[PDB]
Amino acid sequence: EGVSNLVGLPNNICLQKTSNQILKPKLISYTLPVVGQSGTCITDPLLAMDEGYFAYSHLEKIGSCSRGVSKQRIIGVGEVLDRGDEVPSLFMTNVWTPSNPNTVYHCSAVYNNEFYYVLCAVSVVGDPILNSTYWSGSLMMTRLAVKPKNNGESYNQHQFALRNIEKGKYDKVMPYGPSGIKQGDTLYFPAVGFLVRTEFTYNDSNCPIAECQYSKPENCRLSMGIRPNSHYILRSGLLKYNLSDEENSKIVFIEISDQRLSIGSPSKIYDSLGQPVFYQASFSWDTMIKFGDVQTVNPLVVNWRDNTVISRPGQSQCPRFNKCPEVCWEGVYNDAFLIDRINWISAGVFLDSNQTAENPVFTVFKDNEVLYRAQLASEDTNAQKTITNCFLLKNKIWCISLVEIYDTGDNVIRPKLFAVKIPEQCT
Amino acid sequence: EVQLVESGGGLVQPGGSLRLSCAASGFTFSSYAMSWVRQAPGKGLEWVSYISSSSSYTNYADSVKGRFTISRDNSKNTLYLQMNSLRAEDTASYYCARGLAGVWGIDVWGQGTLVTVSS
Amino acid sequence: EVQLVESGGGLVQPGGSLRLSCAASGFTFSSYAMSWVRQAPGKGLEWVSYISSSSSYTNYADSVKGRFTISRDNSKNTLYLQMNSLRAEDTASYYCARGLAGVWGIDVWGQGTLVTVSS
Amino acid sequence: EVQLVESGGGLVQPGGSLRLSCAASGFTFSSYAMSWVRQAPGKGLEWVSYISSSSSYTNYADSVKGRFTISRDNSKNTLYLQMNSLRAEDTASYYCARGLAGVWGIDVWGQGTLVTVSS
Amino acid sequence: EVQLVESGGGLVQPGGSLRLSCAASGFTFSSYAMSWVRQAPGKGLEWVSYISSSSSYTNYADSVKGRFTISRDNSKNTLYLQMNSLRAEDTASYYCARGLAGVWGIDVWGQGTLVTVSS
Ligand SMILES: *[C@@H]1O[C@H](CO)[C@@H](O[C@@H]2O[C@H](CO)[C@@H](O[C@@H]3O[C@H](CO[C@H]4O[C@H](CO[C@H]5O[C@H](CO)[C@@H](O)[C@H](O)[C@@H]5O)[C@@H](O)[C@H](O)[C@@H]4O)[C@@H](O)[C@H](O[C@H]4O[C@H](CO)[C@@H](O)[C@H](O)[C@@H]4O)[C@@H]3O)[C@H](O)[C@H]2NC(C)=O)[C@H](O)[C@H]1NC(C)=O
Ligand SMILES: *[C@@H]1O[C@H](CO)[C@@H](O[C@@H]2O[C@H](CO)[C@@H](O[C@@H]3O[C@H](CO[C@H]4O[C@H](CO)[C@@H](O)[C@H](O)[C@@H]4O)[C@@H](O)[C@H](O[C@H]4O[C@H](CO)[C@@H](O)[C@H](O)[C@@H]4O)[C@@H]3O)[C@H](O)[C@H]2NC(C)=O)[C@H](O)[C@H]1NC(C)=O
Numbered sequence: 054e055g056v057s058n059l060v061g062l063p064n065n066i067c068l069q070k071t072s073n074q075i076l077k078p079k080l081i082s083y084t085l086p087v088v089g090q091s092g093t094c095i096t097d098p099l100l101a102m103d104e105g106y107f108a109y110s111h112l113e114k115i116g117s118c119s120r121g122v123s124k125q126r127i128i129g130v131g132e133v134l135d136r137g138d139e140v141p142s143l144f145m146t147n148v149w150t151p152s153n154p155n156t157v158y159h160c161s162a163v164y165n166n167e168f169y170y171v172l173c174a175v176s177v178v179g180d181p182i183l184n185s186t187y188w189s190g191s192l193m194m195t196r197l198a199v200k201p202k203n204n205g206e207s208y209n210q211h212q213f214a215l216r217n218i219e220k221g222k223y224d225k226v227m228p229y230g231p232s233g234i235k236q237g238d239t240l241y242f243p244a245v246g247f248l249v250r251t252e253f254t255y256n257d258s259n260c261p262i263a264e265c266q267y268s269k270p271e272n273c274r275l276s277m278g279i280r281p282n283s284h285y286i287l288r289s290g291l292l293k294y295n296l297s298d299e300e301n302s303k304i305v306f307i308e309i310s311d312q313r314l315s316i317g318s319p320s321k322i323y324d325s326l327g328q329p330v331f332y333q334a335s336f337s338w339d340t341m342i343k344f345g346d347v348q349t350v351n352p353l354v355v356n357w358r359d360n361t362v363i364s365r366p367g368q369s370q371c372p373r374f375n376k377c378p379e380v381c382w383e384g385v386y387n388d389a390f391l392i393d394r395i396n397w398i399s400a401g402v403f404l405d406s407n408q409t410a411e412n413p414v415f416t417v418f419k420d421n422e423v424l425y426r427a428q429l430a431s432e433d434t435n436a437q438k439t440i441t442n443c444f445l446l447k448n449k450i451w452c453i454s455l456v457e458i459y460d461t462g463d464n465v466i467r468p469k470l471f472a473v474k475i476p477e478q479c480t
Numbered sequence: 481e482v483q484l485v486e487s488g489g490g491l492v493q494p495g496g497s498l499r500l501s502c503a504a505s506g507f508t509f510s511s512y513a514m515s516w517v518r519q520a521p522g523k524g525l526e527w528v529s530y531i532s533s534s535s536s537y538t539n540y541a542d543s544v545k546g547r548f549t550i551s552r553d554n555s556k557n558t559l560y561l562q563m564n565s566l567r568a569e570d571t572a573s574y575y576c577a578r579g580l581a582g583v584w585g586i587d588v589w590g591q592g593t594l595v596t597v598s599s
Numbered sequence: 600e601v602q603l604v605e606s607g608g609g610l611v612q613p614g615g616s617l618r619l620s621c622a623a624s625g626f627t628f629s630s631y632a633m634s635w636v637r638q639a640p641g642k643g644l645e646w647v648s649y650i651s652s653s654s655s656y657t658n659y660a661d662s663v664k665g666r667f668t669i670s671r672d673n674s675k676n677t678l679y680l681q682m683n684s685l686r687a688e689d690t691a692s693y694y695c696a697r698g699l700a701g702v703w704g705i706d707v708w709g710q711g712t713l714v715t716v717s718s
Numbered sequence: 719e720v721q722l723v724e725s726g727g728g729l730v731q732p733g734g735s736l737r738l739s740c741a742a743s744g745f746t747f748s749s750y751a752m753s754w755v756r757q758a759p760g761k762g763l764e765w766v767s768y769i770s771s772s773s774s775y776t777n778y779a780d781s782v783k784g785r786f787t788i789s790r791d792n793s794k795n796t797l798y799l800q801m802n803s804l805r806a807e808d809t810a811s812y813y814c815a816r817g818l819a820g821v822w823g824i825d826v827w828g829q830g831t832l833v834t835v836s837s
Numbered sequence: 838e839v840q841l842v843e844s845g846g847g848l849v850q851p852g853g854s855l856r857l858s859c860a861a862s863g864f865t866f867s868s869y870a871m872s873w874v875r876q877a878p879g880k881g882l883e884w885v886s887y888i889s890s891s892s893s894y895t896n897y898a899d900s901v902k903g904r905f906t907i908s909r910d911n912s913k914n915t916l917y918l919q920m921n922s923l924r925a926e927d928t929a930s931y932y933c934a935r936g937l938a939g940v941w942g943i944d945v946w947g948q949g950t951l952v953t954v955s956s
């Protein structure tokens with residue numbers, strides 16, 4: 054018995070589309086009374102899970118939830134065990150907080166033998182995705198063990214700087230994504246690249262403007278950047294860090310393939326049933342979900358899934374279900390974890406709205422149809438970012454998803470974590 | 481249903497010595513984690529102690545690193561906290577849960593225990 | 600029973616910056632009036648700052664027109680007063696009530712808060 | 719001059735429960751040692767209970783190891799002793815001093831308190 | 838007709854700080870004597886504090902020589918008593934009159950004020 058990841062052969066799960074709600078959302082984030090509440094705000098979440106160990110990160114802002122300040126950034130790992138009877142939970146064991154809260158931005162986690170590296174970006178100009186024209190590029194990776202000991206001083210917290218960077222043509226690298234994966238003795242981190250717009254080689258004749266009459270041809274080139282008259286175009290990729298050499302801290306940013314090349318968005322690569330699955334958010338002309346399994350791990354050659362029913366909402370410019378080139382940088386992060394490979398069954402908390410960001414609903418879809426959905430809250434609570442991770446509980450698949458909702462008696466966007474079990478019997 | 485029963489008391493002189501207790505029932509106490517979490521009116525979560533199942537690891541905060549030491553009584557389900565040399569900045573309501581500080585907690589906080597250090 | 604809990608500070612240097620607070624419970628705070636009232640030993644009532652329910656009207660006195668500005672935090676029932684550029688003539692006990700100056704006040708003044716500006 | 723005011727009476731049934739108290743003044747009670755010393759007519763000194771300044775060490779004798787437990791009240795200068803499950807061999811006069819048993823003593827024994835356990 | 842309205846607090850933790858008040862009307866308070874008198878259920882009169890007319894002489898008892906100090910407010914007819922560091926032997930009803938202890942008193946004791954010091 055033990056809380057492991059998707060390995061071996063799990064039990065038979067529901068393979069049919071039923072309207073009968075067979076999903077049981079279980080809340081495991083019971084917070085204490087916040088009587089005497091203030092203008093607090095919790096944003097920038099992180100949730101990684103691997104072999105029964107989790108991690109969390111959050112930046113509490115006092116005031117506005119976007120243009121706020123930094124007071125504390127609680128980054129800690131822990132163990133994933135049972136609460137006592139067939140209900141898993143996230144038990145934290147180690148907590149780390151940096152001295153200056155307004156330095157750390159855009160962290161990335163990874164799993165190891167008996168440690169948990171947290172690769173964060175260091176900036177002295179604020180949000181690096183907003184003032185990249187003056188950012189240095191220094192990156193700091195913090196190692197936190199999942200099992201602390203007494204008077205270690207070298208086994209509970211050890212930071213190191215990544216001096217050597219193997220940037221070929223990109224001007225800056227930065228960890229951008231919840232977490233990555235490991236391949237034996239090598240660490241991989243999701244990231245985005247910063248490349249000059251005048252140094253881009255993309256013929257403006259491959260833009261999917263066939264059945265897109267209401268779209269200009271240069272929309273593909275204008276969508277690769279945050280703004281049309283910007284100075285950098287984002288490019289997704291991964292950071293390689295082989296902790297077996299240890300001759301010097303190395304950074305290897307391998308760019309993503311050209312198939313369905315979109316703007317830089319939080320990537321998420323995870324292992325499912327042996328094969329690594331890759332995910333990429335949609336903050337560009339393509340509003341549908343970018344799903345697919347990895348066949349070539351290094352160059353990020355991923356067979357993208359052409360799902361036509363799962364997408365993310367947006368503003369009036371680029372709303373949901375808009376598969377045409379348009380100059381826009383907007384969207385919401387909504388991922389999904391693969392629970393089956395024979396039928397390619399995925400599961401994740403995706404929003405259900407046209408031009409709004411409310412009603413967070415957990416939905417299960419194979420490739421082009423929704424199997425069974427379940428609402429984690431009411432149809433008026435807002436939600437911005439969701440992180441979905443699935444695992445096993447000794448005989449069966451279990452999924453814990455961090456969904457930022459709007460609690461009634463909190464008046465603050467609270468990242469409530471639910472526990473949804475994939476059922477083995479449906480109607 | 482997990483029931484957490486906090487105990488102890490407050491209204492002590494500055495620099496005194498208090499002993500907070502918190503018993504529990506339900507889940508198996510012989511192998512689990514316990515931690516004291518306090519919160520002052522106006523502020524949020526602030527952990528002060530941590531202990532493992534076999535009492536092999538005991539973590540504390542920077543402000544209470546040498547104030548008190550958490551213990552474990554796996555024989556008779558309880559959670560003691562021998563608070564020593566407290567100040568006026570320790571006036572808050574303490575809570576016992578199954579997480580160091582986090583934002584976690586898999587049980588409704590039952591009653592808590594307020595500790596007042598003033599005058 | 601309406602309970603008024605005054606807070607803040609005192610014993611500040613001439614020309615400092617203090618922040619007085621006053622929380623309340625009972626009556627609905629979402630739509631009502633709040634006002635700071637001070638009184639020196641020997642004198643009577645002296646109104647300084649007034650604010651409406653929707654924070655649309657903020658009145659001040661001739662002597663404290665530019666000293667401090669009253670705010671409103673209807674989400675969390677309180678009454679702040681960021682006293683700035685005070686002098687020796689501002690040494691008095693401040694009180695919060697539901698009347699601008701008047702001779703009015705529809706609740707017993709609970710404790711008040713003394714502010715001393717000297718030496 | 720150090721004054722020791724002993725209190726508490728006797729004349730209790732065998733196996734009852736009495737509470738002896740002893741207040742003091744003068745010397746600083748926040749950091750010192752207190753000990754109960756009894757003596758029966760015909761015998762000599764007999765120590766029963768000891769306690770430290772910070773209430774971290776509490777020693778007892780072989781005959782009263784489980785009878786009573788000495789406490790400390792550093793806030794209000796006193797010395798309580800919740801005598802429980804006494805016998806006929808505990809009929810003696812109790813005294814409070816600043817030495818465990820010894821032959822020592824840094825103050826004249828003022829009045830004492832006789833406890834009778836018979837019939 | 839002389840009316841003595843006793844006031845103050847009670848039911849407090851032992852070792853705290855209470856402030857008993859007693860206002861009066863009628864006789865000229867600018868030149869007269871006032872004294873606090875208490876009595877426990879079972880015992881008789883027991884004087885604690887005395888104040889003179891011009892606040893030049895303040896006498897106290899042997900048991901409360903350093904507990905509290907009486908004051909005088911000849912401007913506004915009252916009688917304060919800042920009881921500090923009280924014990925369990927101070928659980929009694931306090932009264933104000935025009936005689937130190939005596940058996941005297943030229944006015945009916947109006948209401949009194951019970952002060953309970955226990956637990
Ligand atoms: C994206 O990143 C870039 C670079 O990383 C950011 O650009 C940087 O902006 C900062 C400003 O925050 C520049 O720093 C200096 O700011 C000084 C401001 O002084 C005060 O400003 C506030 C206003 O208070 C004052 O107002 C007036 C202004 O004249 C005064 O008369 C008055 O008395 C007040 O004192 C105060 O609140 C604050 O505390 C400061 O005390 C400037 O004075 C300073 O100018 C120097 O540098 C100039 C060259 O840039 C030079 O020409 C001047 O002569 C002088 O020497 C400077 O602006 C950084 O220098 C600037 N970086 C770069 C590379 O230019 C950008 O803001 C950021 N954007 C976002 C959205 O994050
Ligand atoms: C970036 O993307 C653009 C757009 O796709 C590319 O430009 C196009 O290239 C294709 C070729 O693959 C062009 O298609 C045809 O080009 C012919 C060129 O004629 C000469 O071709 C070679 C030189 O390459 C000579 O040796 C030869 O002798 C010819 O003289 C045209 O003649 C063709 O015309 C046909 O179509 C037009 C309609 O477009 C009809 O009106 C004609 O009657 C005829 O049927 C044909 O066009 C295409 O025209 C190019 N488009 C543009 C806008 O230039 C770039 O090559 C590409 N660049 C890179 C680096 O990838």
Ligand SMILES: *[C@@H]1O[C@H](CO)[C@@H](O[C@@H]2O[C@H](CO)[C@@H](O[C@@H]3O[C@H](CO[C@H]4O[C@H](CO[C@H]5O[C@H](CO)[C@@H](O)[C@H](O)[C@@H]5O)[C@@H](O)[C@H](O)[C@@H]4O)[C@@H](O)[C@H](O)[C@@H]3O)[C@H](O)[C@H]2NC(C)=O)[C@H](O)[C@H]1NC(C)=O
Pocket residue numbers: 238239295296297298
């Ligand atoms: C991360 O970094 C770690 C290092 O810390 C990498 O681990 C290394 O992985 C390489 C894999 O190529 C290991 O290289 C191995 O070398 C073996 C040599 O031992 C035997 O050599 C003779 C056989 O001839 C070999 O000659 C070359 C040598 O490289 C081979 O390529 C040939 O194929 C022949 O096999 C014998 O006669 C001799 O007696 C020795 O027994 C070789 O046998 C292996 O096949 C392999 O090539 C290297 O040793 C590893 N280093 C460590 C410290 O373990 C890891 O790969 C990095 N991760 C990445 C890159 O993702």
Ligand SMILES: *[C@@H]1O[C@H](CO)[C@@H](O[C@@H]2O[C@H](CO)[C@@H](O[C@@H]3O[C@H](CO[C@H]4O[C@H](CO)[C@@H](O)[C@H](O)[C@@H]4O)[C@@H](O)[C@H](O)[C@@H]3O)[C@H](O)[C@H]2NC(C)=O)[C@H](O)[C@H]1NC(C)=O
Pocket residue numbers: 073074075478479480
């Ligand atoms: C949606 O899917 C759900 C999947 O769990 C469906 O729930 C199942 O519904 C069927 C049909 O009603 C039940 O089968 C029957 O259950 C009854 C009642 O079981 C109870 O029996 C005793 C009381 O006698 C009680 O102590 C137990 O705890 C059971 O709760 C039986 O009496 C019948 O013989 C028969 O087995 C399933 O039991 C039930 N699942 C569970 C887990 O209970 C649900 O009905 C579906 N809804 C719709 C609208 O289709």
Ligand SMILES: *[C@@H]1O[C@H](CO)[C@@H](O[C@@H]2O[C@H](CO)[C@@H](O[C@@H]3O[C@H](CO[C@H]4O[C@H](CO)[C@@H](O)[C@H](O)[C@@H]4O)[C@@H](O)[C@H](O)[C@@H]3O)[C@H](O)[C@H]2NC(C)=O)[C@H](O)[C@H]1NC(C)=O
Pocket residue numbers: 373374407
């Ligand atoms: C959420 O987003 C969905 C997808 O974007 C929305 O569905 C779309 O709604 C628009 C509404 O303007 C449709 O656009 C037009 O639909 C009408 C159809 O009505 C007329 O149909 C025939 C002509 O075909 C006519 O004879 C009838 O008398 C009707 O008057 C037409 O004007 C056009 O055909 C045009 O398509 C989209 O078609 C529709 N998309 C899909 C996939 O259904 C949805 O409405 C949004 N909901 C909210 C609440 O915002």
